[PDB]
Amino acid sequence: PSYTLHYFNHRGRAEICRMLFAAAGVQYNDRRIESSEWDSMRNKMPCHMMPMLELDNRTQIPQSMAMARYLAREFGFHGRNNMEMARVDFISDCFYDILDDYMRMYFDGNCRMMFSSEKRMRFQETCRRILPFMERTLEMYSGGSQYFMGDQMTMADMMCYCALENPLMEEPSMLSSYPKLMALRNRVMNHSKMSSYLQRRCRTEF
């Protein structure tokens, strides 16, 4: 099959899909659209929502987590039965929540930069609610010494990686009391296929 990823020149909400493609060794068109060009087409497209995954130059699927789950099931980075999928999903959705609240500090619902302390406090609260739960949740398998699903890396571990990259640039110390999360992120970034993708990827501020 053929894949096209539509998004801005950001890591942002599409980065989970890029990591999935990189991990699976699957080539795709990585379409990075300038904001004003996207903005001028908005009222002319049946599907305007960003990011969006296009399959076989045909089917358009927006909603970043829906896109990621599809790539995960396709490439074998999701759960293998219903229970396992539920676990991969709640972990991933928890990290999406963090990323979503982070993005809401800077961007409106129409993708415009909003460049106040209230949004930052929502974000910081969202971290305090979620991260200790994720540290514990990770510990459920293999004492938390490996991945969220034991020895198989899945989209949950990738979400843990990409969702926290910006928060870590803003506050490099914020994961200091979640040592298992840090070793997992370090494990993901050194994983086969993932190391070279991450080291050769363009440097963007989001």
Place this chain on the structure above:
Amino acid sequence: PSYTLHYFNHRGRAEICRMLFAAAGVQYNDRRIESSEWDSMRNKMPCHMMPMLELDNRTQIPQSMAMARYLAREFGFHGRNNMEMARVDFISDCFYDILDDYMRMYFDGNCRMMFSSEKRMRFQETCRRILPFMERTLEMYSGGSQYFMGDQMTMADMMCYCALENPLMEEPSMLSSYPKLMALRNRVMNHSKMSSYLQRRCRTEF
């Protein structure tokens, strides 16, 4: 298996799961917890996030959409292959977005009532972005005369129903230019198993 749904006395983020249980004819413990009682246990529970689905008095899975997808796959109200699942997911996630922004007008991230115009405008924008896309998306199958996945009702149609109930109480006219969405909601509410559940369910303001 055995099911327990934990949430407040609200329709809110858990209502998708209740509809799923009702549609599948599956009995569960519908646990409606008073807020202050939930609040007093918060720092004593490994999993404090609301809503939460408990399986066999054992596994705790929060994240309302993760919970719903699990019940949907279990009961047969999800897609039957990867592509179909991606379509059910983006539709459901679009409606979650609407519901999420609606809930953010009234509740903080710690479940407290925040009872300003800014949050309402985010919400209203989110409706304008999403609803026309959903009207069109529905039209992809069977001219939009049936359900999002043709003749099978899935969690996507249920989301379309429960996500808009409160917005419709606040503005009963807001779906007037999406006639296919309205006929779908009316189709869901008269569906077998769903009609009696909806007519006998407790009246709550959220």
